[PDB]
């Protein structure tokens, strides 16, 4: 949404389930080379940064898909930042 | 509580009942992949470190849940660090 | 099939007989170094990810072989995802 | 097309898959010295500028080829700027 | 062959056994500094790009050797692109 | 402040948390192209130089924001140079 | 505007986003030969002087366009010099 | 102290209790991202190098804290280098 | 010998007793940091590659030592490649 | 030789081991400022042109030295252009 | 001093820490445009020549400051040329 | 010594223990920014080239120290090139 880009610096630090979001987004948005490129950089925030590297090329129609994925996996930190 | 993050270095070394706390937190907070990921690393404190890897994504409504679980299982070490 | 790549995210989580599939595919498709490389990463889905790392190099003639192996081992989760 | 030169300032900023366009266009249009020359300038838009340096030497028959490449790789940002 | 330069963009993406080709080509063609330089860049296609950087310095008498090595390791993807 | 430009040569050498300051300053002052341009130049002070390249374009109303960010992350080196 | 020529010596020194202004003014005002000619002279103010070399061939109808570009990119240094 | 920087090359090789010092220094000096960044690099001295990467930003008031932690854990190698 | 560098690609794959050769070479040739660095990378050939990383710095006087160690441990694969 | 100046246009494009030729020629012919000056211009042929800038100051007695260096490193592209 | 202009040709070739001398002299003597202008010309001595372009506009009261900077950074090449 | 500059091209290729030489030379000769700058460029000889970039700034009194370090760590390649 605009919630993703609005709360960018907070979602960099408190998300700990990248490995599942990658499988949720595979095929639909992220190509394979980017999927392999994200699986590196052991520092966990770096996976988030490298993931947000492909955010500027997204329209309003798929950031919503990622927000649904976050609402299926966590659904608590989403509510934590919403409140 | 704030007691959990306040007394981290003491709770890493002196908690010896991970195998039950994992069952207390299952379904409610911990997903299945993280649950399988904790059951490794034979060094007993390392399971505690892997558990605290998921602490930053916790709100005030579930750290209390974990302290309740510790007051049901141990209830003396909780009192030992409280005093 | 195209069913293997179509239901990838579901097959990552619910297949629990990797140690036999590896023996089914040995000699025919997987070389020895890859076979030794898969037997690591205690987190059970990670073996599945390491297995799908070698999938892009598969044609229509061997993915069918893997679906045959799954129909010999599980044959219920295959039936569970087909329905 | 004329869409490439019409939306230049938008395509400079929102394209994040240059490393694949180079291989799609290799041999057909871009010589090798240009291919090695693009793989520099870490600032990602700078690869786009260095690529548009070779646009004036293109006819109507190959800018269409590049639009096909974008419709095969992204096909969403293309649709985002079309609408 | 000329098959190597003919199917460059396809061979960038679908080859997953670089770690063995390196040992096949060592001593005969590739010097040691290039051998150490290839063992980097975790993105798997980048190893392929850095490898094809040394392709222009090859005559007709050694690309045949590399195709033989590819026919000894995979022997299916060679057949997959041949058909 | 005037403290930022007053102690420039000391702050070039002893700051080790650039990757977080960028996320604190993102959206508000630094555009995205500069953000991508800073994540280069492995020599750690060079990130500081490239960051101070955009300092002359700052008024009194945002250097205060950067000093607040330094007082939230480090809060000791700020205190170390103040004393 | 007349603000541009009124504050010439201040806008020579404190503008750090030439690389975007060029893309804002491209096609509308600046021809391509000047666009390539400005991208030289590593000293950043020299790009500004070379840009103001083309100010005399501008009417009241396009300096306004450039001030709009500065109000979209920076919008703070403009406000800093206005006050 | 000055003893930490004076005997740097000796403390790189003979300290084998990083996993505990990290918990001793957590919250007080090391932020979370650096704590996650140290827990990598299987080569045991590399954790020491990555830890000393954050040493130049320390005043006299916390290097003493680290020497106290070393005197509580080891208390023999400190005495070994002192004598 | 020259047999070590001559049969490199065969010795990468068929030696399965690294943990003993390391003890044979300790103190005499390998320093301790390299010894710790080799005991990683679970894929068994990777220990061989990391071991041959230190081969170019060997004279004729110690590669013979390694061949004697292999003739004490294996003495069949040595004979298998000799014949 | 006269082969160097005779096959200049072929040796500009297909030589990919400049970084070693520099060390082969160091001390004997190239001064230090030229040695540092060649290590720039990421485009690989540009190092070749900057290298041939110093060819006119060479007699018949050192172009032979460079041909010897090329026959020691590559010895196949030399053979490829000889035939 | 007069030592700077007396040993100019020796200080052109053997100084390897320009990037710090610039920060030592910044604000006091060097303006910002000269600071940006020196940071070019990859050939390391060229930064030294461009630096000595501004020596003629210096009195006896600041060449002493620059010699102090050299005695704080190197203090050996100063000592090497003094002896 | 003069042995260091005489056998430069041989010491570029056959030394594999840079990570220890850096700690031997730290504080005494190499400043910290150069120390951080050397720990890059994954190609093992490139660390050596970046190291010899600072060699011209060494007198007869410290190259001896570096040869002592080489005789303490390796003491075999030193003897190998001496003979």
Author numbering:
A (entry chain L), B (entry chain D), C (entry chain K), D (entry chain H), E (entry chain J), F (entry chain G), ...: 112 to 194
Tell me what the authors wrote about this structure, in their words.
Many NLR proteins nucleate the “inflammasome”—a large macromolecular complex that triggers inflammatory cell death and cytokine secretion in response to microbial or danger-associated ligands. Like many other supramolecular assemblies in the human innate immune system, the inflammasome complex relies on homotypic and heterotypic interactions between the death domains (DDs) to initiate, amplify, and propagate pyroptotic signaling. Extending this analysis, we also found that specific type II interface motifs directly dictate the compatibility of heterotypic pairwise CARD-CARD interactions among NLRP1, CARD8, NLRC4, ASC, and CASP1.
To test this, we first identified the Type II interfaces in published ASC-CARD and CASP1-CARD filament structures. In ASC-CARD filaments, this bridge consists of two residues Gln185 and Tyr187, which extend from the Type IIb surface and interact with Ala168 and Asn170 on the Type IIa surface. To do so, ASC-CARD must engage upstream sensors, self-oligomerize, and activate CASP1-CARD simultaneously. For instance, instead of a prominent negative Asp residue in CARD8 Type IIb surface, ASC-CARD uses a less-charged Asn residue to enhance the interaction with Ala168 on its own type IIa surface.
